[model samples]
Target: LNPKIIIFEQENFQGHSHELNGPCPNLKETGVEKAGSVLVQAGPWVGYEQANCKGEQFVFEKGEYPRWDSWTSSRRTDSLSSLRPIKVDSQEHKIILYENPNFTGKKMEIIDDDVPSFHAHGYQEKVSSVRVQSGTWVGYQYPGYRGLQYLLEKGDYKDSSDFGAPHPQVQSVRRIRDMQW
Candidate 1:
């Protein structure tokens, strides 16, 4: 549950900086006018497009987000107005991706593996529902973990919207590992 992250007011780690170890619902409360970049020092964290940890979701691991572009691939919303640590409760990973809503249609069962491109795995299609049997995961709209990212905490996502996605189009997925530092 311990994580250290910093937010910058300007791109590339310049301008007013705010460090957070836990959930910061709204960056406004910290008196930071805006956020353009982030640095994840310890644990994996999820940055949001709107306040109160809502809106578009982007996950950042132990790395450097030199600018908003590094954190945002959807290009729909560039705001990093909220953030919080993501929970990875297990060492193993298992995810069940379904084609249609409510867990109906073709499916792929992934166990302890990270999928960079679902096409290579032979399940290249819309992912309308998902079931996370263990650990946490992040789904990418495009291959190689690019495009919109949807966080899958341990639970059942009956539909794509249940995981913060507007459509069933996940193309890549990987487990949220424990902290690297």
Candidate 2:
């Protein structure tokens, strides 16, 4: 498989943490969501601590598929680096970011607060923005690992944090649906 790429442009708006969560405020009327400036902290998930953005590191030794689903997983990556914030849409109102980008050895995904379940294994439980409001949790699932077994037998599934923008050239947005609030 080829490496994937994604780019999330930011939205322009601002509102108090409370206001940002409830409704999609009118950019002009509210003047809440600043147009271009990074509206971090406006909402709980607006921005990530630049420090925490740092990613772990390792190396992916070439190997064979070995088994199902995860024939050959990422054994390693470059050095650890911070995970910066990125806008999800042109509006940038709903932002997007990657957590453990350099975390090699395991293929991961992300799960936003929209999901309410976390089964067993390395699968992260409930990853939230401010405390279950927004944001995503990074997770991974593949055959052989205890997590994958649970995923197949018990339906143990984590959210999408483990999987974010595939790479830098990502041209299309997959699954992310319209936000209700």
Candidate 3:
């Protein structure tokens, strides 16, 4: 999808605004020092907390965010310094996170391309095992794609520690393109 997004400086989109159709190296150059809200018009986007696309990152899909709290609860009032489009390839994205070891207990299935937090689905800090049927997924220890990152291929994970994590508490996940280089 052709990506398009608008960042606002105040809640309810009341202050200055900036529209972006592609990658922006520096959001400050466009007078968007603080993004209080966001409107995703086309494709999904990855927002950065620092310039040059560095620092904390959060994925935002097509939607309307009227306030900073609606964007993310972690850094509700922080400024966004960079933004870029997420180019998803043609792949059947799917994953299953289990609440118990050996893929037992209640399970949550994810077929979408990006998920900001498992807490949004009432499954926060509850993932003990995983079944990645398709696609390469990146799991984060904390919500909003922050903290430890684990790369999972198309396979089954008996435990979160198997992925080099301290516990079965993945908060965010997203599919990544297959590595070719």
Candidate 4:
């Protein structure tokens, strides 16, 4: 079945609200200008910073996001302008980060785990490209999962720009397994 999420008009889930079960390219028709808060009842949704699912990313797990901070830590932008449910198809996850745009140079293969610091793995240059072979994932600009977010859905991100990143400086990544929540 489709996933479910609640986009609230005000923080703490106050004011009018709208529930979503599929991709919402834009929320203008919903009469909700911004997502002041959120509730992912049956989620693991990917909320975008801009409408049409563009710009920065926010990973909404199955839980309450009473404030923007609850769902985002980057403080870049607290807007969930557009969003869609993230599909996690595999239990085993695999990802390859490359140092160059065309998948050349040093590489790091991660399977079924989250790396808080790519530097900790001794491959601390930058993630210029990516290949998410088996699962959905999110990459962070800085170590410890801080900074801007880039959603790495199951596919090939040939270059950092392909993943909506302004630069090839991702330093952390994590899997979005098939959620039971």
Q: RMSD of each candidate?
A: 17.3, 23.7, 15.1, 17.2
The 10 consecutive residues of candidate 1 with the worst lDDT sum are 29-38
- In model 4, state the lDDT of residue 65: 86
Tell me the TM-score of each prediction against the true structure. Answer: 0.49, 0.15, 0.48, 0.49
Among all windows of 10 consecutive residues in model 3, the one with the lowest summed lDDT is: 68-77
Instruction: Report lDDT (CA) for all predictions.
Output: 0.87, 0.24, 0.85, 0.88
In terms of lDDT, the poorest run of 10 residues in model 4 is 71-80
What lDDT is reached at residue 26 by model 3? 94
Off by over 4 Å in 1: 92-181
The digit string of per-residue lDDT tens for model 4 on 20-50 reads 9999999766777687999999978898988
Residue 56 error, candidate 2, Å: 32
Residue 8, model 4, lDDT: 85
**Which is superior by lDDT, 1 or 2?**
1
Question: Residue 66: error of model 2 in Å?
Answer: 43
Candidate 1 CA-lDDT value: 0.87
**Residue-level lDDT tens digits of model 2 in 1-181:** 2221111122222223122322222322333222222222322222211123322321212222112112113424311122222333532112232222332223224233222222323433222111112332222232222232111111222333223312221111122445679
Instruction: Report the C-alpha lDDT of model 3 over 1-181, residue by residue, as the tens digit.
Output: 3679999888787789999999998988888787888999986889888899988787898898887566556863476889999887766779998999999998888896688988888886478899999888899988889999999888989988888888778889988866679
